[PDB]
C-alpha cells in the first residue's frame, strides 16, 4: 500500500496473507479475504501458477510472531472460468480457495461480509484498502499490515479518457487516484473495505495498477467488483 498507515491488530480480521513455498521457507505473494471458515477469496492472477500455497489468518507482522496466527493448507483452487491471463482488462479476476482445514474464528479472525448482488457504490464512497504490499513504487513489502483511505471513483469517471478509458469495465471498481495513495505490488488479491449502512463490506478484490507505477495521478487502483460475482461465489461454495 502506498501512502498508508499501520492498521490496528484487530480492525480488519478477514484479511489473509496468501503465501507460497519458496526455497526453504514461505513467502508472501498476495492478499485475500476469508469468506467462509474454509473458503478464501482472492485474485485469479494470484493463483495463476503451479506453486504450493498456504494461507495465513490472524496475521499482522509478516516476520515476527504475533500471538494469533493460524496457518492452513490450500486444498482446492477454483478460478473464474472466463479468466484470461493474457487479458487482465477483460475482467474475471477472481478466485476461490478451499482450505485444508477450517479456521477458528476469534477477534483476529472473522468472516468478511459480502455486498448484495448488483450493488454499485456512489462516487466518492468511503473505502479502505489493506495489505502487506509495497510501500512505494519499486520499493519493498511492508512488514506490518497497512491501510489507506481510498474513496471510490465511479464507472463514468473511471472509464473516461483522462483516467482509465476502456481498460476498465463495469465489472470493476475504481478507487483512489490522487497520486498519493495506492494499492501496490503484493496487495492484489486483497479486499477493498467499504462502509455501507454502518458496516464495512468487501466490495473489491485488488487486481491492477498502472504500468507507470502504483500511485499515479488519476489512475486509481482497480478492483474486481465483488457484487458482480455473488451468484458465482455462492454456486461454487455450494458445489464443491
Amino acid at each position: 500500500v502506498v501512502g498508508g498507515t499501520e492498521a490496528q491488530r484487530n480492525s480488519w480480521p478477514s484479511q489473509i496473507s496468501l503465501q507460497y513455498r519458496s526455497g526453504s521457507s514461505w513467502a508472501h505473494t498476495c492478499g485475500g479475504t476469508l469468506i467462509r471458515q474454509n473458503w478464501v477469496m482472492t485474485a485469479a492472477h494470484c493463483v495463476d501458477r503451479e506453486l504450493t500455497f498456504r494461507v495465513v489468518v490472524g496475521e499482522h507482522n509478516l516476520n515476527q510472531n504475533n500471538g494469533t496466527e493460524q496457518y492452513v493448507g490450500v486444498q482446492k483452487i477454483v478460478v473464474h472460468p472466463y479468466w484470461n491471463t493474457d487479458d487482465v482488462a477483460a475482467g474475471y479476476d477472481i478466485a476461490l480457495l478451499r482450505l485444508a482445514q477450517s479456521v477458528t474464528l476469534n477477534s483476529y479472525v472473522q468472516l468478511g461480509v459480502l455486498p448484495r448482488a448488483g450493488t454499485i457504490l456512489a462516487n466518492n464512497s468511503p473505502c479502505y484498502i489493506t495489505g502487506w504490499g509495497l510501500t512505494r513504487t519499486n520499493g519493498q513489502l511492508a512488514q506490518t499490515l497497512q491501510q489507506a483511505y481510498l474513496p471510490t471513483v465511479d464507472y463514468a469517471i473511471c472509464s473516461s479518457s483522462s483516467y482509465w478509458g476502456s481498460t476498465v469495465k463495469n465489472s470493476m471498481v475504481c478507487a483512489g487516484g490522487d497520486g498519493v495513495r495506492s494499492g501496490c505490488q503484493g496487495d492484489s488479491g486483497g479486499p477493498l473495505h467499504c462502509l455501507v449502512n454502518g458496516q464495512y463490506a468487501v466490495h473489491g478484490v485488488t487486481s491492477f495498477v498502472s504500468r507507470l507505477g502504483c500511485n499515479v495521478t488519476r489512475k486509481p487502483t482497480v478492483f474486481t467488483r465483488v457484487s458482480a460475482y455473488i451468484s458465482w461465489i455462492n454456486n461454487v461454495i455450494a458445489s464443491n
Partner: peptide, 8 residues
C-alpha cells in the same frame, strides 16, 4: 493494466 503480483 499491470497486475498486483510479481509480476502478473
Amino acid at each position: 493494466x499491470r497486475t498486483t503480483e510479481f509480476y502478473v
